[PDB]
Design brief:
The structure is cut from a larger assembly and holds two copies of chain A, two copies of chain B and two copies of chain C. Chain A is α+β, with helices and mostly antiparallel strands. Chain A has four helices and ten strands; from the N terminus they run ααβββααβββββββ. Chain A has a four-stranded antiparallel β-sheet with strand order 5-6-7-8, with no helix packed on it. Chain A starts with a helix and ends with a strand. By secondary structure, chain B is mainly α. In chain B, α1 packs across α4. Chain B is extended, with a radius of gyration of 24 Å. Chain C has one domain: Cytochrome Bc1 Complex, Chain C (Up-down Bundle). The chains are: A alpha+beta, B mainly alpha, C mainly alpha. Chains in contact: A-B, A-C, A-D, A-E, B-D, B-F, C-D, C-E, C-F, D-F, E-F. Chains C and E meet through α4 and α10 of C and α5 of E. The complex binds heme C (HEC) (6 copies) and FE2/S2 (inorganic) cluster (2 copies). The site of one heme C has 24 residues of chain C, from α3, α5, α6 and α9. Chains B, E: InterPro entries: Cyt_c-like_dom, Cyt_c-like_dom_sf, Cyt_c1. Chains B, E: Component of the ubiquinol-cytochrome c reductase complex (complex III or cytochrome b-c1 complex), which is a respiratory chain that generates an electrochemical potential coupled to ATP synthesis. c1 functions as an electron donor to cytochrome c. Chains B, E: It is a single-pass membrane protein. Chains B, E: It comes from Rhodobacter capsulatus (strain ATCC BAA-309 / NBRC 16581 / SB1003).
């Protein structure tokens, strides 16, 4: 029939066109060489605890910074109230409250948390690298792209950045190493 | 007869046990001189070929040579994301990444590895440091074997590669007679993989497309026969 | 009326055998002897400027691509190979880089000339639509291009202006990864951008094809709210040679200034930080993307829930429309509303030379544009936040409400007749 | 006669407000409902094939350029990155590489269809000129492109097909160096070729624009020496939907065969030596540039002063016209004479379906083309030299002398009237 | 006053003796830590800057570090065609190829090299391993010198570079007082060369083009005034 | 005047156009990094005289091959007659006849010529690399691009190649070295 045959030819043409177009939009996706996206062993190895440590991985920096007491007390003295993101973005644990006890890090295979904190050095606003070394209006990190003030533990404050600095999955290698991945 | 492989045709998605056997041979024999830079180590898990266990891949990778770095000069752990090593010179040979296409291809490798017999009865002394091969055609020939106008009277020529295997060079874990011929076939298939890993996807795409386009073409033929009917009916 | 004067192909046998391919008929009848009014000021030249600048950029780029190598490890080195070894080098690069600046400067004057003399008003909607489409294409082009040197500002500008697409929910990260070729920026992004950057200009030329086809079929605006009175038209001298020569004179002046810049002040419009190689591990201060995107950058980074006029606290009614998404929508709307203008101005009138209130509001709009340009570079600390919010609010207010109210109560002026204004 | 049927824009308000930009008027009146005769065989499809193939190549190339890195140290590696990691990879490359083959195969049938049915005869000269220009552009394109993989055949093909330009005296080495970017081949040549290779297709599209404009203004040739009898023309059905559907059916068949090749016989038309990296220190045996340049390669390497019909010993009268230059001139002339044809055939007649002697000579010409194709691959040793000389001589003889003699004494046939051939 | 250079203006084609002095300074002082990879050595013969004698260039090149190869790993003799070396880490600094543009540029280098005075009377102890500069602005500052909201009260900050020169570090062959200021000016000019070698050609092109385009524009103005005369005469 | 002014404006436009076009045609010329085009010291260093020696330089190979007596006698027994190119392309000397005495090479800083011959391994037809190791119909080199037969001393024979294999400027470094340039 007129209608059936004509419309079916059109439908088949459309289907073939789409099957040909999809790969032109698929090739731009991450290729297998980008699929890898594996782990990195960074050795703390006495870098003079308290200043900072940055390492490249996955194309983004991974901040490993020791703790300075003044920085710590400022951290532990932050009630969940008035905290933009209280989710403790760290993926090594559940959505537990963004508390310094949970938010600092594992305990060297020992029992302590207020001494090391390794987070992803990527601003949640649009992915810039905040400046460290005690900066901003909260004694933490400052993003120069739009002005987002981070706190000691990395929780976002005073800016458009919606959430704090995430924490990747990491465990220790018996007191001198870090496993990122 | 011609000892056709599995992939030689419209089907034949790279029987994988053959490729695992070829891998057992390549890493224990050919790797001593040859390399495959154009081949990542993470392809030994991708479908289509040897779907090995990733953990074994990481182990085998860390057990290879040291590929230093691209940013900070320091001998690393040769992570799988890197490529197979490269043997370059001082008694070494070319790269086998795509040698299965730079020549019907794999049959060349089979009938080449197959054939290193003694020197014929024209130049039994042969040559020092060079060995004789039935099928290589790009090697030197002694003047005793050339004709009146420079052409060689031998089937093949003298290749710089020594005989790679003896009667029973290695054992197969699956259980199989590991004679020279089976090893040659297996390694040929492995190299063809290293060169054309996306073969099976090629064939499946070809099937799908042939089908869809035959359908479209039939429908268009019907539409044409219809439209052109009132003008081709009286004659 | 609309005298085409096809020339009747009566010249000679050459002009008679050309009846196989009409081409010269087209040129003569239409694109050279196109009746244009006499009342044209010096604001109707910038289109010639834009066409020439586009040709210039295309040429210089085709030349550079003979020495630029798209790769993270060989881009900077290739750029220096250009500026040092190649014969002309610095010239091509400075002419390419700065000419983009002139291009955008010229489109700004081309656009604001239009908003004044009712060039968006009917029957000239298609030209406006095509022009906004172009503007978009050329913005995207310049963005893709600022990345190729793989300096330091390249990386971070790309980072943020791609995190935008990721702000939106559900389909943000997917688009981000599909655009960057991966989770973050690397050589794949560079290849995409180079290709794309080496392809869109031709689309622009075609769109310019339609741009020129439209306003030849539709008469050029003229300083007044009047047409060429087709019904024989003592007004409306032709294009060639009069307006051709006028435009070429202005273009010579403009190129003179442009080359003076290129030769004495070439690194002025640039960012020095783009002369240091990239470090994904260190971000510089005051990225300041560029100068032809500061308006929208500011409209974006203004809405942050930091003012009593903060509509983000109200838009939070829906838990999906957060701040970032709100700013992105605000920018896209800042452009979409400029495109929608011709259906917002409810006036059966024309050029604001006879609409005073419109004059005042329009000059305020120009000032707002300049202010936004100056604010995108300054931090988000008080007082600049209030300034940016005010300016964005006025932009939207103008384009949404102001024009209707005028079209209602904005006719205290005697319109001029007789486009032949022999004053 | 020549019913354009502009549609009068009477559809509705949408088709009436489109009086701002005519576009749909153009499409409908001209490029869709173009009266074409009924007498069309299956040889009038290959133009659609060529257009589709061009689109295909442009698309696949724009995709590849997102992963190809022009540099001696990273081209091969990028090609393998494509064929292994990328999602589609092998498909794009095989479709790009082979589609060039189909492109040239299709132009060959497009051209030889033309030589038979007097499509070069008046009043269709402009189409012929434009087509030869295109042919040149696309040959140069394919050449620039075969180089990009930086294999082994790439290098040496470039070497020789650039030494050609250097053969000529006085201005040979200068042009050679200005084209290679240096004394010999290196990355500079690669960058030039990539850019150029990524630019000419658009020029081809424009030229295709003029190609299509011409034969719409000038009626499509038809199997007969007759026109559409404009004065109403019961003959000459329209293009859409009839011929559109016919061409699409043939195109579906062709793509079916093409994809079967791509998926089962993709490396068949290629040279394996292009899968080994380049060594400027070692040349392989039987470079054999490609299969769409063997005719001219043979016409070139035929004249060597090695036959009693060797006109080189006679051309040596002038001490400047040596052999090499003679072969280069012979090739350029092999093409220039094909372009000059329409002014050599001195016949007031048309399609050779009514000119027997022409049929015989033409089939001999097709055979000569095939023979030249088969000879450019075989060495210059006896007897192939005599064969190549004979074939080139016949090519030139046909195109220079044969057509005049026919036009003189070639009318023993009853021409058909009434292009409505209801047989 | 501001100690303007020669090239600071519409003229000033890089007084070359200044650049030879800067070269004496750079290879004997700054080269110990810094590098200029983006700079070929052969440029020391190209016009515009130091038009040294090629033979001395080849000598000075062979007298530098060993840049191994790109094809065969082997420490070569470092031919001029290669680039200046690169000092990368372990107490070393950035590359000075284009540092004269990544900052009015050379004035930064002059007023930076100039200024390493002792620690002020806010933190006389200073810092261990870091030294003070009055113009660098991207360095750390002790908390004793910061204001109530993190801003520094010092003009400059603490830079990781030590003082490069003393009162009379090197001798000039031409004959000139080699105090610190003259050396700073000279090396600043040398770096500006290394960054913008094609400056003089820039200026000459600008002159030529300004002239030709002014001429063209004048002629077009006359043509316009003429053509538009019969329409602008009665008013 | 009408004529003068109009024609002068056109002339100035043309001049400016040409001054702008020339560099677009100049940039494609050899750049300064290609200008270098200097020398190379290849060490003969006992490579078993008689087979061959090839080295890269200027982007082309430089053939350094010792002499085999049979190859020599075939060379020295070639009268200038029936020799396509009798110019002795070698640029280390004048246009003296293409004779083996002049065409072989300098004499190690000693006195002998029939033992070494270093020429540019570039076919004069269109620049291909002939195959060595005793090939062709004259016991020399064979070009596979179009079939040009070279002789022992490198003089062209039996093919389209018009002239023999050139000889660059080269002198010896006291019995173990070669200076190319
Ligand atoms: C060194 C002890 C070798 C080992 C073990 C293997 N190969 Fe090899 N191979 C070697 C050399 C020096 C050469 C060059 C030979 C020449 O005359 O140039 C080769 C060559 C090959 C080739 C290419 C043959 C050709 O036609 O060019 C192939 C296909 C090849 N070799 C295969 C191969 C395999 C499968 C091996 C493991 C079983 C293997 N070779 C080992 C040196 C050495
Ligand atoms: C090691 C003993 C050095 C020598 C000798 C010179 N420089 Fe250097 N320089 C060095 C370091 C470690 C740094 C980094 C300083 C920091 O705090 O990051 C520098 C920096 C510079 C700079 C850049 C300043 C800036 O604003 O970033 C310049 C312009 C500079 N140095 C110039 C310079 C000159 C001209 C020298 C020779 C006279 C010289 N330096 C020597 C290490 C060392
Ligand atoms: C044929 C290629 C090509 C075309 C066409 C082209 N460019 Fe470019 N562009 C390049 C290359 C190559 C670079 C990198 C070299 C450079 O920066 O000068 C570049 C860089 C740029 C830069 C950064 C300049 C710098 O030095 O950082 C901008 C801005 C830019 N392009 C804008 C544009 C715009 C806008 C257009 C047209 C609408 C355009 N380009 C047309 C090739 C091209
Ligand atoms: C967003 C708006 C916009 C953009 C961007 C734009 N145009 Fe226009 N253009 C217009 C309008 C409106 C007119 C007035 C048409 C009329 O008067 O009929 C116009 C007119 C013109 C004219 C003829 C009269 C004049 O003003 O010179 C030319 C030529 C022209 N444009 C070229 C260009 C070129 C070339 C570009 C880009 C490369 C461009 N334009 C970009 C909207 C635009
Ligand atoms: C947008 C870019 C682009 C366009 C348009 C394009 N190609 Fe290519 N072409 C490439 C790239 C990239 C390569 C190298 C990768 C490859 O070989 O597949 C290439 C390679 C080739 C090759 C060698 C194929 C191989 O694998 O050795 C041929 C032949 C070729 N092109 C011909 C053409 C012709 C003929 C056209 C159109 C008339 C065309 N190309 C259009 C990008 C393009
Ligand atoms: C050297 C000659 C030549 C070349 C190459 C050529 N054409 Fe043609 N083309 C012709 C001639 C002659 C005709 C017949 C015109 C007529 O009958 O009026 C024609 C007709 C056509 C037609 C309409 C009738 C038909 O034969 O299908 C189309 C469509 C077409 N060409 C497209 C193309 C495209 C697309 C290309 C290249 C990408 C191309 N041609 C290359 C000479 C050429
Ligand atoms: S990107 Fe980090 S705050 Fe804007
Ligand atoms: S190129 Fe050497 S003979 Fe043709």
């Amino acid at each position: 029939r007129r209608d059936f045959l004509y419309h079916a030819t059109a439908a088949t043409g459309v289907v073939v066109t789409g099957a040909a177009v999809w790969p032109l939009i698929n090739q731009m996706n991450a290729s297998a060489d980008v699929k890898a996206m594996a782990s990195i062993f960074v050795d703390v190895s006495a870098v003079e605890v308290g200043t900072q440590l940055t390492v490249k991985w996955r194309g983004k920096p991974v901040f490993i910074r020791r703790r300075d007491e003044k920085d710590i007390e400022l951290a532990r003295s932050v009630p969940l109230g008035a905290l933009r993101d209280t989710s403790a973005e760290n993926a090594n644990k559940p959505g537990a409250e963004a508390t310094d006890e949970n938010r600092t890090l594992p305990a060297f295979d020992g029992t302590n948390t207020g001494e090391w904190l390794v987070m992803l050095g990527v601003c949640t606003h649009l992915g810039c690298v905040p400046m460290g070394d005690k900066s901003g209006d909260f004694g933490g990190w400052f993003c120069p792209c739009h002005g987002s003030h981070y706190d000691s533990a990395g929780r976002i404050r005073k800016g458009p950045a919606p959430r704090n600095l995430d924490i990747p999955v990491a465990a220790f290698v018996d007191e001198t190493t870090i496993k990122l991945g | 007869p011609d000892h056709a492989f599995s992939f030689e045709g419209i089907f034949g998605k790279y029987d994988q046990a053959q490729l695992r056997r070829g891998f057992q041979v390549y890493n224990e024999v050919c790797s001593a001189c040859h390399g495959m830079k154009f081949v990542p180590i993470r392809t030994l898990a991708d479908d289509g070929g040897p779907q090995l266990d990733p953990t074994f891949v990481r182990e085998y990778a860390a057990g290879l040579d040291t590929i230093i770095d691209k940013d900070s000069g320091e001998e690393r752990d040769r992570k799988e994301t890197d490529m197979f090593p490269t043997r370059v010179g001082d008694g070494m040979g070319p790269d086998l990444s795509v040698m299965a296409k730079a020549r019907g291809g794999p049959e060349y490798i089979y009938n080449y590895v197959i054939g290193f017999e003694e020197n014929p009865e024209c130049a039994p002394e042969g040559i020092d440091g060079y060995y004789y091969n039935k099928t290589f055609q790009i090697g030197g020939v002694p003047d005793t074997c050339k004709d009146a106008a420079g052409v060689k009277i031998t089937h093949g020529s003298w290749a710089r590669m020594p005989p790679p295997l003896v009667d029973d060079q290695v054992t197969y874990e699956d259980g199989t007679p590991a004679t020279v011929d089976q090893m040659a076939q297996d390694v040929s298939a492995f190299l063809m993989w290293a060169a054309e890993p996306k073969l099976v996807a090629r064939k499946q795409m070809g099937l799908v497309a042939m089908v869809m386009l035959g359908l479209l073409s039939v429908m268009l033929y019907l539409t044409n026969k219809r439209l052109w009917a009132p003008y081709k009916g009286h004659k | 009326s609309g005298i085409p004067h096809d020339h009747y192909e009566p010249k000679t046998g050459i002009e008679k055998w050309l009846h196989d391919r009409l081409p010269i008929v087209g040129l003569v009848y239409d694109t050279i002897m196109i009746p244009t009014p006499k009342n044209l000021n010096w604001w109707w030249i910038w289109g010639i400027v834009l066409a020439f600048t586009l040709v210039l950029q295309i040429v210089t780029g085709i030349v550079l691509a003979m020495h630029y190598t798209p790769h993270v490890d060989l881009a900077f080195a290739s750029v220096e190979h250009i500026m040092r070894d190649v014969n002309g080098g610095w010239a091509m690069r400075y002419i390419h880089a700065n000419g983009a600046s002139l291009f955008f400067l010229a489109v700004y004057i081309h656009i604001f000339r239009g908003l004044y003399y009712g060039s968006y008003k009917a029957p000239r909607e298609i030209t406006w639509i095509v022009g906004m489409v172009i503007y978009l294409l050329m913005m995207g082009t310049a963005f893709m291009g600022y990345v190729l040197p793989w300096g330091q500002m390249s990386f971070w500008g790309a980072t943020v202006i791609t995190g935008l697409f990721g702000a939106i929910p559900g389909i943000g990260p997917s688009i981000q990864a599909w655009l960057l070729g991966g989770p973050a920026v690397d050589n794949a992004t560079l290849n995409r951008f180079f290709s794309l950057h080496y392809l869109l200009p031709f689309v622009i030329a075609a769109l310019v094809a339609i741009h020129i086809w439209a306003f030849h079929t539709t008469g050029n605006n003229n300083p007044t709210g009047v047409e060429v009175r087709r019904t024989a038209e003592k007004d409306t001298l032709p294009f060639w040679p009069y307006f051709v020569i006028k435009d070429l004179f202005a273009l010579a002046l403009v190129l003179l200034g442009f080359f003076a810049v290129v030769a004495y002040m070439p690194n002025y419009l640039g960012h020095p930080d783009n002369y240091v190689q990239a470090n994904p591990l260190s971000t510089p201060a005051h990225i300041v993307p560029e100068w032809y995107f500061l308006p929208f950058y500011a409209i974006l980074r203004a809405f942050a829930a930091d003012v009593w006029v903060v509509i983000l606290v109200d838009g939070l009614t829906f838990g999906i429309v957060d701040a970032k998404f709100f700013g992105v929508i605000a920018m896209f709307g800042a452009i979409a509303v400029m495109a929608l203008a011709p259906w917002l101005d409810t006036s059966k009138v024309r050029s604001g030379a006879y609409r005073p209130k419109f004059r005042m509001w329009f000059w305020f709009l120009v000032l707002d544009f300049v202010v936004l340009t100056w604010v995108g570079a300054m931090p988000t600390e008080y007082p600049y936040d209030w300034i940016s919010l005010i300016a964005s609010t006025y932009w939207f207010a103008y384009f949404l409400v102001i024009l209707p109210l005028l079209g209602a109560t904005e006719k205290p002026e005697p319109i001029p007749a007789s486009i032949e204004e022999d004053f």
